[PDB]
Amino acid sequence: MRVCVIGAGLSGLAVGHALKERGISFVCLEKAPDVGGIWRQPGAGERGPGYRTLHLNTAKQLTGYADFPMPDAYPLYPRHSQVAAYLRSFAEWAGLLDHVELRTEVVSVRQDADGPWTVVSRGADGAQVSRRFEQVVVASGHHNEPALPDPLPAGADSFAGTILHSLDYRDGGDFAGRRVVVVGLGASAVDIAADLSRHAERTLLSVRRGLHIVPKQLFGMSVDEIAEAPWWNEMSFDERRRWVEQALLVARGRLSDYGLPEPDHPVFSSATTLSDEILSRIRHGAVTPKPAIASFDGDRVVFTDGTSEPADAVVYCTGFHMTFPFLPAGCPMSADGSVELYRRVVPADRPGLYFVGLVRPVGAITRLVEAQAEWVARLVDGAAVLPAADQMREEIGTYLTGIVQRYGRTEGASIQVDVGPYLAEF
Ligand SMILES: Cc1cc2nc3c(=O)[nH]c(=O)nc-3n(C[C@H](O)[C@H](O)[C@H](O)COP(=O)(O)OP(=O)(O)OC[C@H]3O[C@@H](n4cnc5c(N)ncnc54)[C@H](O)[C@@H]3O)c2cc1C
Ligand SMILES: NC(=O)c1ccc[n+]([C@@H]2O[C@H](COP(=O)([O-])OP(=O)(O)OC[C@H]3O[C@@H](n4cnc5c(N)ncnc54)[C@H](OP(=O)(O)O)[C@@H]3O)[C@@H](O)[C@H]2O)c1
Ligand SMILES: CC(C)=CCc1ccc2c(C/C=N\O)c[nH]c2c1
């Protein structure tokens, strides 16, 4: 009755546990057969971002719910299987399952001209239903639509192999004995190559830009756990750069010495891809660096260096677009694409709407989703209020005029935040 929480991922669950702790009527509507978000799919063979080799890249003490510690015996980087099971367990322990409608897909969402919202949802039967809720929390994720290169390399309609995205990648095993080109230098690409390196007769990694490649642990301590060190803080933004710069040459040297394109801008001023394996897998010829693809010569792929290779398949780890198909109207976004959400959560013009999770921290988000849930719960019952809409558009336009100034015009930069200062305001 009171709140429709869209989705039962890490974010809905956190949200459904903040509303219950305050006594608010609410339901969570998930489209999948269980809760867990993306973490549940690798494991039921379902098409999602993850893959049979997906483990955390952040620490457990910092990625689990602060009030629901992850099992003792779990490692620093548990696997998709262990996380999905911790999440199911959290919903069990926080009483949220009585509230979750599974296999119920939200087809649509909309404001009526009095403030409650009609929410249409699709039952497994495909049979549709419309209901009405006073408030709606969107917790749908921003990794739902794959981002294929728009000009797809010519000749791809006449390739004799399988062109695919990391959403459809599942097991390194399905590619046994075959020849594949992973496209990307992100955490999905470095991971799929490393898998394909132990299953496919050959694995090539097509890169086009070059990203600082960091190992998961420096000095024994994970990159998230150092960003929380008091010693790492209390260090200026150049004391750190050089620290790391000095730090990564001693740990992996230079990347031009691995056949990888050097990045144009230094660490922190260019994305980092975390990986403890992709440099070794190269130094062992399990994966071979390539430039970008230029065409598909039936049975083979051509690169911008002139090189050719027989290639049964090509898995494009090119990333994801954020869509909200159930918001028949502007997604939080307006104009250049800038997402317009106050404190990264509140639509300025739409009362009754909240967005939990749209943020990309440098690190694990769990603590960021938890804050948003608590504040959203206080906004929903009236224990918290927002500024007027004109003043909310000042915080947004400040965050944006600033985002184009430390990150510069680029993509998805407008959901990007600093963990510490942002979670201080909660
Ligand atoms: C491949 C990958 C690996 C990652 N690894 C890490 C990591 O190691 N550490 C880390 O800190 N972060 C990681 N992240 C970041 C990631 O965003 C979070 O781990 C986490 O998934 C956020 O959960 P969420 O609930 O916001 O979104 P999701 O996990 O995407 O779940 C959102 C849920 O909304 C549901 N939903 C969406 N639309 C509808 C609809 N119309 N009707 C009903 N239900 C709907 C979906 O079923 C989904 O289960 C990773 C992200 C990806 C893509
Ligand atoms: N736990 C883990 O280890 C793990 C695993 C997977 C994913 N993740 C997370 O999930 C999210 C998904 O990111 P992702 O790894 O899928 O990738 P991403 O960060 O979205 O970047 C995609 C990669 O593809 C490249 N690319 C983009 N467009 C391209 C094009 N047209 N042609 C060729 N290459 C292109 C990008 O290089 P350019 O951008 O320079 O073009 C980049 O290297 C991230 O937030 C990531 O941290 C984490
Ligand atoms: C100690 C160091 C080098 C910290 C740097 C650092 C930079 C970027 C990322 C990302 C990418 C963010 N969103 O995709 C995830 N973890 C990161 C860590």
Side-chain angles (χ1 to χ4, degrees):
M1 176 82 79
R2 253 190 123 186
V3 175
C4 180
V5 199
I6 304 171
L10 173 113
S11 294
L13 308 169
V15 153
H17 168 75
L19 286 158
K20 186 153 166 319
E21 209 76 358
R22 267 191 110 76
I24 304 134
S25 147
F26 80 77
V27 268
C28 158
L29 306 184
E30 174 85 0
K31 45 164 36 183
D34 207 348
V35 311
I38 56 123
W39 297 103
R40 203 202 55 80
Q41 299 177 301
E46 292 199 5
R47 273 343 156 235
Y51 19 94
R52 195 107 199 87
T53 52
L54 178 72
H55 288 229
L56 284 169
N57 76 18
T58 36
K60 104 174 178 233
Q61 318 96 2
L62 327 173
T63 321
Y65 281 123
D67 25 6
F68 202 69
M70 292 206 197
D72 59 311
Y74 267 20
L76 193 76
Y77 313 123
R79 181 191 110 141
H80 69 78
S81 78
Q82 275 168 319
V83 172
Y86 161 74
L87 289 192
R88 168 52 194 226
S89 180
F90 163 86
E92 283 175 359
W93 169 97
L96 320 174
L97 245 125
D98 165 54
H99 305 62
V100 184
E101 243 167 83
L102 277 309
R103 320 173 108 149
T104 302
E105 176 201 0
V106 174
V107 178
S108 164
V109 169
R110 197 134 62 193
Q111 230 184 353
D112 311 323
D114 56 302
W117 304 69
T118 54
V119 174
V120 196
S121 70
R122 202 200 35 82
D125 27 56
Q128 256 175 23
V129 130
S130 143
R131 314 175 240 191
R132 245 178 143 247
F133 304 85
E134 159 183 310
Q135 319 218 5
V136 191
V137 186
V138 178
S140 312
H142 43 278
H143 301 115
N144 12 48
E145 165 125 26
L148 279 190
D150 181 36
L152 242 207
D157 286 281
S158 39
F159 171 54
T162 302
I163 335 209
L164 68 141
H165 191 278
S166 18
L167 188 109
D168 303 88
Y169 182 97
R170 162 203 158 144
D171 209 337
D174 299 327
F175 284 74
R178 293 188 134 161
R179 296 129 207 119
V180 191
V181 187
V182 268
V183 187
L185 197 60
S188 311
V190 296
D191 271 0
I192 283 146
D195 190 29
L196 285 173
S197 129
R198 309 194 138 104
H199 291 99
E201 143 210 34
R202 198 117 172 291
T203 307
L204 296 185
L205 180 98
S206 181
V207 208
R208 112 225 212 88
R209 190 79 159 132
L211 299 158
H212 286 99
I213 278 156
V214 190
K216 281 181 121 179
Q217 143 272 132
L218 269 86
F219 284 93
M221 337 170 31
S222 223
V223 326
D224 44 343
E225 290 180 294
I226 69 106
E228 259 69 86
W231 56 263
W232 162 267
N233 293 278
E234 170 237 5
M235 254 176 114
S236 146
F237 307 89
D238 129 286
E239 284 156 11
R240 289 155 177 199
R241 209 206 29 242
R242 310 189 185 246
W243 186 88
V244 171
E245 280 165 3
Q246 230 291 334
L248 312 163
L249 315 182
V250 71
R252 50 128 221 231
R254 324 176 103 109
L255 310 148
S256 268
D257 293 336
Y258 293 79
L260 298 151
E262 279 284 341
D264 9 316
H265 306 278
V267 45
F268 313 126
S269 336
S270 105
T272 72
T273 281
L274 294 188
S275 199
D276 252 357
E277 276 197 272
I278 229 266
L279 292 183
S280 188
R281 302 308 307 163
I282 277 169
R283 284 271 176 111
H284 287 78
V287 202
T288 322
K290 245 62 214 5
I293 300 187
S295 100
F296 291 88
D297 222 317
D299 117 268
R300 295 170 86 81
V301 156
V302 196
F303 293 95
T304 55
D305 58 351
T307 66
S308 164
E309 219 100 14
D312 317 342
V314 175
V315 46
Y316 265 102
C317 317
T318 32
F320 284 98
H321 300 299
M322 22 182 134
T323 64
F324 288 101
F326 50 79
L327 289 177
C331 300
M333 300 202 198
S334 167
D336 241 332
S338 358
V339 320
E340 280 169 343
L341 298 171
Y342 161 79
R343 301 182 77 233
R344 315 295 75 69
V345 166
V346 205
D349 39 318
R350 325 128 188 242
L353 193 55
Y354 300 97
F355 280 96
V356 174
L358 218 63
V359 280
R360 207 135 43 102
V362 200
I365 202 178
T366 308
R367 304 266 176 301
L368 288 79
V369 164
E370 279 177 345
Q372 297 174 334
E374 219 280 324
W375 184 51
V376 162
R378 311 182 277 135
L379 304 172
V380 151
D381 69 356
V385 306
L386 305 158
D390 286 344
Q391 260 82 60
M392 262 192 306
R393 285 179 221 107
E394 295 180 43
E395 190 267 339
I396 295 180
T398 272
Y399 159 85
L400 295 175
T401 52
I403 269 317
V404 210
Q405 136 150 29
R406 81 135 132 181
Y407 284 149
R409 252 150 244 129
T410 320
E411 188 71 310
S414 99
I415 66 94
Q416 273 210 276
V417 282
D418 255 8
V419 266
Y422 178 72
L423 243 59
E425 328 274 359
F426 288 100

